[PDB]
Design a protein around this ligand. Structure first.
Ligand SMILES: [Ca+2]
Ligand SMILES: [Cu+]
Ligand SMILES: [Cu+]
Ligand SMILES: [Cu+]
Ligand SMILES: [Cu+]
Lengths: 69, 68
């Protein structure tokens, strides 16, 4: 298993958090996703054989948020 | 038809806008609802015999926003 924290800009409220958690948690291989809204950190745990960091970042950017470099 | 504008604090994005639009619009007696995020204002047209200003304000507060 891998555990990664992504730095995300543009989330402003708990609806934004729920959009990210729903979109990331629907990727095959993710086991958990939680967000620290104040810090703009998205914590994810996943099976890297089934899903990549980039897949997760692309899901977040598809929801309109920017993922730091 | 009756109308009311409410000043609403706490909305921060288009998800908030939609939450307000949905919860107010779902109230029996509401004819139309417009949210201005930038101005923090909500305009509602409604049948005051079926829904009240307080019902509208309460629906907005139940979504987590303050009503002035
Ligand atoms: Ca009545
Ligand atoms: Cu939001
Ligand atoms: Cu949002
Ligand atoms: Cu929002
Ligand atoms: Cu929101």
């Amino acid at each position: 298993m891998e555990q990664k924290t992504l730095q995300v800009e543009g989330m402003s409220c708990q609806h934004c958090v729920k959009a990210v958690e729903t979109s990331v948690g629907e990727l095959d291989g993710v086991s958990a996703v939680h967000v620290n809204l104040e810090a703009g950190k998205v914590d994810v745990s996943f099976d890297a054989d089934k899903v990549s960091v980039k897949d997760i970042a692309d899901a977040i950017e598809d929801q309109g948020y920017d993922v730091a470099k």
